[PDB]
Structure 1
Amino acid sequence: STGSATTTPIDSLDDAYITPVQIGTPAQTLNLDFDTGSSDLWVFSSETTASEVDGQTIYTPSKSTTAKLLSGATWSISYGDGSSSSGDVYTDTVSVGGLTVTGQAVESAKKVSSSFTEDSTIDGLLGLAFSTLNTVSPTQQKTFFDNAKASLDSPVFTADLGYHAPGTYNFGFIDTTAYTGSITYTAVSTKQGFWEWTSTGYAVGSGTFKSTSIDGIADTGTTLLYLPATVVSAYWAQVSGAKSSSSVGGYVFPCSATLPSFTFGVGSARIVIPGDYIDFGPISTGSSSCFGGIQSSAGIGINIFGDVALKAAFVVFNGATTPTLGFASK
């Protein structure tokens, strides 16, 4: 089997992307944030505290003929941005882009933090990291990908995120029309439960490539590119008037600037992030200070190749016995 679903930016900045997901029978379609940095499929639901729901579409298990309470199971998750959610668990039929999994754990939120409530466009998360990170207790649950894997034509999924445009998540096949040149594959460590890999270096604009190992994770659920402070300082030093602002929460730069590109290495290959992708717009409506899309990973404890990086590439998440990542230009 295969599946193919379009993923759409939630707003004009590409802050996150939502993908429609069918849950239950008859189908209830919710727009979920596919997150290769976490491993829980959780939804706003009929169980979510009413004051914490503001415009989201909810899953109502009582209206699904295929929903079963997973008796005794609970979940609770905290993300890197300080947001959180928790609740109980159902199993139900879940379909993405025509690919169906029966018996998928659907984590029903009883509580969500303010950042989730305030984002009316995101009805929940679909985790695509390794199932070792799944928070369901006392019986850990599998991701949608892990449950689908055996049925797929090839044990893979691909992320093809758009810049200010829709893109695609495919499951079970690699669309050879969706990228240019060849795909460069690189090793993955699953030791922390992430799609963790090592970039071979970077360049700023038209500058020389610096060969240096940068461990990090491929994380579709993180907006920006978080890299070591040395790398980030070298990038922003090429932008007139850029500075790190402790008041704002990272590097800012004059909205009048033209940003340089940023290149990262994948083996001997290179992915170029256009400068435009690194613009996250005014720090507040009408401001002439703009927020940067490349930020320091200092204090996060990991480097994160978030959407700013991933959207510059066609990305293969190869879930074979020995996982690998692949990157191609597009």
Structure 2
Amino acid sequence: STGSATTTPIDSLDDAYITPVQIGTPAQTLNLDFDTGSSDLWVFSSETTASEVDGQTIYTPSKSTTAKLLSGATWSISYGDGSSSSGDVYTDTVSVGGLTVTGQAVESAKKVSSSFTEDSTIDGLLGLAFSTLNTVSPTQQKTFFDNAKASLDSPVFTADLGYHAPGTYNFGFIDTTAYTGSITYTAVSTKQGFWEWTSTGYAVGSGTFKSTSIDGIADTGTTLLYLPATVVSAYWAQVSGAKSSSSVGGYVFPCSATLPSFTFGVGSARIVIPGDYIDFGPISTGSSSCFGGIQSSAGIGINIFGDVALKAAFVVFNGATTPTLGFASK
């Protein structure tokens, strides 16, 4: 089997991407944030505290004839940006782009943090990291991809995120028309439950490539590119007037600036992030100071190849017995 679904930026800055997901019988379609950095499929629901729901589409398990309460099961997640949510668990039928899993754990939110309430476009998350990170207690549950894997034509999914444009998540096949050149594959460590890999280095604009190992995660659920302070300093040094602002919480730059590209290494291959992808617009409405899309990972504890990086590539998440990651230009 295979599946294919269009993924759409939630706003003009590409802050996140949503993908429609069918849950239950009859289908309830929710727009979920596909997140290769986490492993829970959780949704706004009829059980969510009313004051915490503001425009989201909810899952109502009582209206799904295939929903079954998973007895005694609860979940709770606190993300690396202060965000959190929690609730109970149903199993139900879940389909993405024509690919169907029966008995998928659907984590129904009783509580969500403010940041989720305030984002009316995201109805929940669909985790695509390794099932070892799933938070369901007392019995951990499998991700959608883990449940689908054995049925797929090939045990893979691909992320093709757009810059200011729609893109695609495919399951079970590689669309060879979706990229240019070849896919370069690189080793993955699953030791922390992430799609964790080692970039071979970077360049800033048309500058010389610096060969240096950068360990990080491919994370579709993180907006920006978080890299070591040395690397980030080297990038913003090429932008006149850019500076790190403690009050704002990162590097800012004059909105009139032209940003250089940023290149990262995948083995001997190179992915070029156009400078425009690194512009996240005014720090506050009407400001002429703009927020940078490359920021320091110091104090995150890990480097993160978020959407800024991933949207410059066609990315293969290969879930073979020994997982690997593939990157191609597009």
Same fold (TM over 0.5): yes
The secondary structure found in structure 1 opposite 2:215 is strand
Q: 2 CA distance for matches of 1:187 and 1:82? A: 30
Cα shift readout 1:200-229 (whole Å, capped 9, x = no counterpart): 000000000000000000000000000000
CA-CA distance at 1:126 after TM superposition: 0.1
Q: Deviations over 1:202-260 (max 9, x none)?
A: 00000000000000000000000000000000000000000000000100000010000
Q: Which residue of 1 aligns with 2:176?
A: 176
Q: CA deviation at 1:171?
A: 0.1
- The aligned counterpart of 1:284 is 284
Please name the residue that 1:202 is paired with. Answer: 202
How much does 1:57 deviate? 0.1
**What are the superposed Cα offsets for residues 102-126 of structure 1, whole Å, 9 maximum, x if unpaired?**
0000000000000000000000000
Structure 2 residue matching 1:117: 3-state secondary structure:
helix
The Cα offsets for residues 139-160 of structure 1, whole Å up to 9 and x where unpaired, read as 0000000000000000000000
Structure 2 counterpart of 1:222 = 222
Q: CA deviation at 1:186?
A: 0.1
Q: Does 1:262 align with 2:266?
A: no
Q: Deviations over 1:256-297 (max 9, x none)?
A: 100000000000000000000000000011100000000000
Let me know the Cα RMSD of the aligned residues. 0.2
Output the TM-score relative to the length of structure 1: 1.00
Inter-partner Cα distance in structure 2 for 1:174 and 1:256:
39
Percentage identity across paired residues of the two chains: 100
- Deviation of the 1:169 alpha carbon: 0.1
Gaps of 5+ in 2: none
Equivalences for residues 118-137 of structure 1 within 5 A:
118-137=118-137
Cα distance in 2 for partners of 1:98, 1:2 equals: 7
Residue in 2 that maps onto 1:76: 76
Distance in 1 (CA, whole Å) between partners of 2:124 and 2:20 is: 11
Instruction: Give the Cα–Cα distance (whole angstroms) in 1 for the partners of residues 165 and 201 of structure 2.
Output: 28
Q: Counterpart of 1:301?
A: 301
Partner Cα distance (1:32, 1:80) in 2: 19
Q: Does 1:242 align with 2:239?
A: no
Residue of structure 1 equivalent to 2:10: 10
Structure 2-normalised TM-score? 1.00
- The Cα offsets for residues 39-61 of structure 1, whole Å up to 9 and x where unpaired, read as 00000000000000000000000
Quote the offset at 1:62 in angstroms. Answer: 0.2
CA distance, structure 2, for counterparts of residue 67 and residue 85 of structure 1: 21
Report what 1:113 is aligned to: 113
Paired position in structure 2 for 1:329: 329
**Structure 2 partner of 1:21:** 21
CA deviation string 1:22-49 (max 9, x = no partner): 0000000000000000000000000000
What secondary structure is seen at the aligned counterpart in 2 of 1:7?
strand
Counterpart-to-counterpart distance in 2, 1:110 and 1:283: 32
CA distance in 2, matches of 1:130, 1:256: 41
Pairwise CA distance, 1:79 = 0.6
Map residues 44-193 of structure 1 onto 2, 5 A cutoff: 44-193=44-193
- Look up the SS of the partner of 1:208 in the other structure: coil
Could you tell me how far 1:162 is from its partner in structure 2? Answer: 0.1
Structure 2 residue matching 1:230: 3-state secondary structure:
helix
Say which SS state the counterpart of residue 191 (structure 2) adopts.
coil
- Structure 1 runs not aligned, ≥5 long: none
Q: Deviations over 1:146-190 (max 9, x none)?
A: 000000000000000000001000000000000000000000000
Runs of 4+ in 1 over 3 A off after TM superposition: none
Instruction: Return the alpha-carbon distance in structure 2 between the equivalents of residues 283 and 75 of structure 1.
Output: 34
Give the whole-Å Cα distance in 2 for the aligned partners of 1:154 and 1:85. 33
Counterpart secondary structure, 1:231: helix
Alpha-carbon distance in structure 2 between the residues aligned to 1:195 and 1:207: 29
User: For 1:169 and 1:142, how far apart are their aligned partners in 2?
Assistant: 19
- Matches of 2:201 and 2:80, distance apart in 1: 24
Q: Deviations over 1:271-329 (max 9, x none)?
A: 00000000000001110000000000000000000000000000000000000000000
SS at match of 2:75: strand
- Return the offset for 1:71: 0.5
- Secondary structure, in 3 states, of the residue corresponding to 1:232? helix
